[PDB]
Design a protein around this ligand. Sequence first.
Ligand SMILES: O=C(O)CNC(=O)Cn1ccc2ccc(Br)cc21
Ligand SMILES: O=C(O)CNC(=O)Cn1ccc2ccc(Br)cc21
Ligand SMILES: O=C(O)CNC(=O)Cn1ccc2ccc(Br)cc21
Ligand SMILES: O=C(O)CNC(=O)Cn1ccc2ccc(Br)cc21
Ligand code: NA
Ligand code: NA
Ligand code: NA
Ligand code: NA
Ligand code: NA
Ligand code: NA
Ligand code: NA
Ligand code: NA
Lengths: 380, 380, 380, 380
Amino acid sequence: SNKKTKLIHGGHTTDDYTGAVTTPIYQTSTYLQDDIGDLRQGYEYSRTANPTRSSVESVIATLENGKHGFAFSSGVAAISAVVMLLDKGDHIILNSDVYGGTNRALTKVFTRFGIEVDFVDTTHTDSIVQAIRPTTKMLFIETPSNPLLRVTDIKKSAEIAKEHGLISVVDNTFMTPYYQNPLDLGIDIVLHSATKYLGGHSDVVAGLVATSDDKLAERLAFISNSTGGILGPQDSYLLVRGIKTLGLRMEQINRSVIEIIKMLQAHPAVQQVFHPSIESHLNHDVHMAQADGHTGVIAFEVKNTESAKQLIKATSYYTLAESLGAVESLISVPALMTHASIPADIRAKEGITDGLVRISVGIEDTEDLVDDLKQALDTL
Amino acid sequence: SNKKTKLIHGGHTTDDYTGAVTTPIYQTSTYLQDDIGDLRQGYEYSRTANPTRSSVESVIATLENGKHGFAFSSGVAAISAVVMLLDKGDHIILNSDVYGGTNRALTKVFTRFGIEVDFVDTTHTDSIVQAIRPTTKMLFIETPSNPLLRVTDIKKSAEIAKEHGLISVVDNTFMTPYYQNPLDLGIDIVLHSATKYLGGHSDVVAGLVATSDDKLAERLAFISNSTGGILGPQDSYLLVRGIKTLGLRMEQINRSVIEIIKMLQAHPAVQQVFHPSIESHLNHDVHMAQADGHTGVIAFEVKNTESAKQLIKATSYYTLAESLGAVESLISVPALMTHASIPADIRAKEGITDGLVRISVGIEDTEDLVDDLKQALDTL
Amino acid sequence: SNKKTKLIHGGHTTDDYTGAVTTPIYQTSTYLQDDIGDLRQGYEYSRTANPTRSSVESVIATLENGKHGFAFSSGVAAISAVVMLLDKGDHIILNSDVYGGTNRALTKVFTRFGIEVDFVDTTHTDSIVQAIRPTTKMLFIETPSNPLLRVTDIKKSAEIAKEHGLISVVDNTFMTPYYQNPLDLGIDIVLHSATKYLGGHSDVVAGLVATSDDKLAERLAFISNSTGGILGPQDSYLLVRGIKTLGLRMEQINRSVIEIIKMLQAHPAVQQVFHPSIESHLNHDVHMAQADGHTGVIAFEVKNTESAKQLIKATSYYTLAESLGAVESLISVPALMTHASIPADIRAKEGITDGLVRISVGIEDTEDLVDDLKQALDTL
Amino acid sequence: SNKKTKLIHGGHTTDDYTGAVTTPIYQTSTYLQDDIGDLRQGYEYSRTANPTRSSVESVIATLENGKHGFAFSSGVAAISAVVMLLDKGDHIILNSDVYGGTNRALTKVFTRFGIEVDFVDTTHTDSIVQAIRPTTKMLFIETPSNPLLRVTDIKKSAEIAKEHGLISVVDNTFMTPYYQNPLDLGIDIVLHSATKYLGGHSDVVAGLVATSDDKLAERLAFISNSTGGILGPQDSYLLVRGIKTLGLRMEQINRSVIEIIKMLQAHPAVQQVFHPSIESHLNHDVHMAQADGHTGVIAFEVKNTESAKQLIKATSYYTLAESLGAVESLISVPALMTHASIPADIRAKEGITDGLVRISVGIEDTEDLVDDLKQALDTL
Ligand SMILES: O=C(O)CNC(=O)Cn1ccc2ccc(Br)cc21
Ligand SMILES: O=C(O)CNC(=O)Cn1ccc2ccc(Br)cc21
Ligand SMILES: O=C(O)CNC(=O)Cn1ccc2ccc(Br)cc21
Ligand SMILES: O=C(O)CNC(=O)Cn1ccc2ccc(Br)cc21
Ligand code: NA
Ligand code: NA
Ligand code: NA
Ligand code: NA
Ligand code: NA
Ligand code: NA
Ligand code: NA
Ligand code: NA
């Protein structure tokens, strides 16, 4: 019924045979056949299907109200599988500030295979309509985006995509199925870096894909079986396990996010704050209309590089590392860590200033995270 | 020094920090940075590099006398990564009876990205020379091949590839680094389905790639990081562990292979036997010149489908399942299990008769495997 | 600082060497020595010490404000290790309704080794004073107890134990270190079945022991190394991982517990309810004084066996299985599952009626758990 | 039929449900019940029984020709469980040079519980007959023993034990079920540190017990369930996996053992060599009559401590670490590492000289191990 209950009881995460209340880990590559072609339970080769992976696939399908789930060895493997629904000569529209790994896969791997790519600012959906070519076959959006949390209208993107015969795809990593369900809004395919919130514990690299479309699912299965970027059984198990606490973790993260944003907006050493909960944020109304909560990623400006480094050194509970969606609160400086290859002037123009800090809020005590960040800001 | 010693002491499979005599399992996605950019031990994100995966990568690099190792989520993910060294418009020569999954990846995924593919019978290397187009960039060979164990001259293929500016690739799955080292013979890239002999225990799906070429390695690393078909840490650990007994397993398998072949050639219910150890096998001399032993895969003809099914039912120690390189001896009928989509007449023309049986010899007692197969054949 | 923060940042759960933000899994039995006796990082044999186990041991030591942690293969192995601090001829006082496995270990294993056992109702601590013999060496209490949740004054028990030279032990399983810290109240040794709340996900069987006493710790280490009931590295890792969400899980469980108890007290088909939050519960004041929250175990009476079985069948979100502290809400009937060997009349006298139901509240949605249990009760 | 076949096909190591050719890893603590008491497949709580552990238990039962198998968290936990078949006042006869951990468990833990212990030199079985008291209930022998490889007549010990009403126990760690089957010779209980040869890869700490006696098995099950030193599922899986190559590993180890002993007997820097294959070794005939091969543990004398340390430093392929039965060849100096607490004069009297070296032969190349040890000895 309700979400926290569905997290526990939705999908197949028990063993029908023994009754084990957790999914067994099928550390196996192949399966006995009783007669040639006769498969006891539908399994014949683990690359094609593995029962632990099938369990996590059913979880993501259930959580996104889809029919089909697919587990990949990483988020970018999920993205690559989805892009491989296209042919040489096909064209993709992506939101212009799409994830660096996504940008790099598309512009440096798949353009060598004749996939044409255009980045457009989808915060105004009519941009999509302008960018559509006769060869356009896919519309790929993250919302909210990294690191400035730009919001894109999911329902309108789905309508545009249906009208123009496009496969619509949403990278729902930042929101998780707990707050935002793109398939409910008309999108064809939803994907996740389960490396982030879903696994939740910084100990799995994994991607998950869900869809309700039987032909898209058949094609995704074929691509998974042929290019073989499958998630292994141990990681599938740890994914199923981490997802159990998704709702509790996201809700704690959200309480902390609200309070941290109040602090940041009040602090003199902080200039701009980027997060879809702020009412002056572009498409705040759209986000509230398509999501029931918030990502834990917040970005904000301090003065310069020296202040950002000082902030990192002075916090006790914000940890300097890559990635997001940990139980630990994570801190980073995009201009130095994710966007350093970009010329300084283009970083400035895009808003990636030297003192732009990104925090990923964890599940520590709210008052501790607020006070720690505030005292560190006070050292500026 | 000697191979069985190198299997134990080659590569990095201990923990420098604690002294643990086995590789720790780094079930982790991200790593603390002491200062922005400062990585304690070179790790920053597990998709990019993980220390357990790095350990198995160093093992395969060492075993193939290469400089660089790469671990993928499956053999076909390794193959796909290697194929992605090419661009739209490039052309690949493969041996004509290449592995079904390889055939399907190339002809159904990568041809949609403009990769051009030609299958040629490489048992005569001048066929390669005839097939070379101005657009040809890669030469990809398995030797021996599945299911008829056709042998291709590795050294001559490497020379042809160097002369014509081609990346040469060998799928060394069937022989393993224990018996055949293509990089020693001039090949650019060697790959494996570690799902088979290397893991050895039917409990890992994995691919491994090794090369000595720094620029090819840099490109492979970039492809791995961008398309993300990485092997996870638990599977990397089980791979390192299974490789320890590779030499013992392969040698037992070889003793059994020799004796089983004597039996099969003597038996009246068996027609043709396919294996590179038989002196009348095409390129027997070539195989002996480029390998120090034999694959455990043998194929042989019985009369028809009914005799093949009876053979399977009557053996006590040959197990009906997909895959090869298990500790168990495996048995299959290609015409029904791997080549059933092919019209009957083309199967006959290629030698995939209804009574063509493939066995993958395991590590059971030699006399037991010989006697069991013989008594089952006697029931025909 | 605050508890939810300490759960994340307390103890050693990262890799100092690589910076991995999670504890590496040292699936290893032995360690290189650089010179005879020279241990790189203090490890020499995994039974004696393993770095993943050491990590979980430091977590439990930190969470209980102790100095020393010990991880065992199960809760009853932890209990057995602690009991083995005694000699033949020594005497133990336990609370009279102690856990069945504990009762059985003491009365059927350790009495054969000359350990003398007396069960006393410790809800009045002067009972302890009466039961003390010249040979008494240990006082062992659970609070609250199973299945009727009897509360024992921890601080007074510790004082009595100090005055009389007794080792005091608390089985803190039901409360967890998140709500109750017996070492802070003078107790010598605190233990847990980490199989329940601490692991939290029904996928580890494990025991944990913490103490601040250096000589007790030395003796426990000696017993662990000699009788060898050690927790393995994979289970230690899953324990560390499950503990991260302990606070979030316990707080959700507590919100649901409060609401479920309101429902149960109002319902006509329910007679008595047993839980330390009810103000008429014996030693309610004591529990509130020594704990900051509540166990998720509740017991309550329906009419008879048929009503209890009907309750189980009619609930959608209460699962029939053994154990407690899952993410799933669990339901059981003690008179049939844990106390069936006891004669019916003695069960009645102890309050284990045929319609005594025990629920272990999970982390499902509060309103769903309340409504589901209520509609099931309405079917009576 | 034959041993190498039985290693592969004996016991239950597949999944009946899916057909998985390896035992699934049941990382689980509890099991759904369909009705109260109704267990789908006989499982209800993982401490009591776990299906992965049950799989490894069936393997050890099969390999020792017993009926019942038990997996413990370590070898010393197996030993402790077996000793707990006794009561206060009972008496045990052990062989006088029994394993240090065994000696310490008995003389420092179980004597505090009133178990009486006598060490006797069982190389003459009439010593047992002299040592038997009216209170003696158990006879516990290792053969061959550590570090001097003393051999005890198993069949005669079993007869003596039957005549006098004693439970007979053999620690069969050094020989493995591959070469020596004490239950076939009348012994009641056989146990192993599976930490050594059976796991075989230095990555599991585990104990295994097998018996054919239904009442002894019932008592062992009760002790396991009450004191809880159970092996976890991941370690049970790695045990099942390592056992597959037991025969191949032991046979390689034996070839190397024969050749190394020839070298050692010929070398001038080596005095005495201890191994049951040497024909002048005490009870050589007995060992050959009760075993089909040899342990990989060899001990031999060099001049002094300085020569032993030099030997260790000069070998390339002998690794200094604790434990035995690795794939690596291990080297140690008992007088410094396992027997250092013993006064020097008593070490001399027992034969534990300062230059007594113990090697545990691994699976490296035979010629490499011989040559490496010989060149190191030549540096003396
Ligand atoms: O480091 C990386 O992967 C590159 N950086 C990115 O994240 C993605 N990206 C690619 C081109 C480009 C232009 C402006 C901005 Br703003 C971002 C851009
Ligand atoms: O089932 C499969 O994947 C198809 N079969 C194969 O294995 C590969 N393959 C693809 C075309 C083709 C023609 C003749 C022969 Br012979 C084999 C061929
Ligand atoms: O099944 C079991 O293990 C036994 N039952 C228990 O839980 C523990 N126990 C042992 C004696 C005894 C008397 C009254 C009550 Br009330 C409980 C008792
Ligand atoms: O270090 C240890 O655990 C002690 N040493 C041992 O291995 C066992 N042991 C115990 C008494 C004793 C006397 C002579 C000899 Br020889 C060995 C003895
Ligand atoms: Na919604
Ligand atoms: Na739709
Ligand atoms: Na060679
Ligand atoms: Na080369
Ligand atoms: Na408190
Ligand atoms: Na104290
Ligand atoms: Na024998
Ligand atoms: Na017997």
